[PDB]
Design a protein around this ligand. Sequence first.
Ligand SMILES: CC(=O)N1c2ccc(-c3ccc(C(=O)O)cc3)cc2[C@H](Nc2ccc(Cl)cc2)C[C@@H]1C
Length: 115
Amino acid sequence: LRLSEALKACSNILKDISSQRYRDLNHFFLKPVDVVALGLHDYYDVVKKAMDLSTIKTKLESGQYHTKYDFADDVRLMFNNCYKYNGEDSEVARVGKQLQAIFDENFAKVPDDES
Ligand SMILES: CC(=O)N1c2ccc(-c3ccc(C(=O)O)cc3)cc2[C@H](Nc2ccc(Cl)cc2)C[C@@H]1C
């Protein structure tokens, strides 16, 4: 599975946002939400499709994203699930916003899909 130049750039961004350098922002997003471990009420009444950084990596590296936009859709899904479930004043949403801002700045530099 050889990725396009755009999706290789996406892989590098994903690695960067998932890295130890941002651990205080990303640790909440590394692995799937586990309703039992986290004590959550009503999570899947609010969130239709869960997403997290490990799943994004699996999907990217197994060829499930055809364009950089498919990849970005799942990054945004992950963040939006967090905001909508937890509320934007929650601690986790606040760090999410910081991580998303880093993602957005870097994703704007990814080349065209056909290059
Ligand atoms: C992303 C998201 O929306 N949620 C989420 C996901 C993972 C973890 C989590 C992840 C790893 C650990 C750990 O390494 O121990 C602990 C909690 C925690 C949460 C959120 N819980 C939480 C986050 C911050 C604070 Cl100060 C208190 C509670 C719940 C939410 C569903």
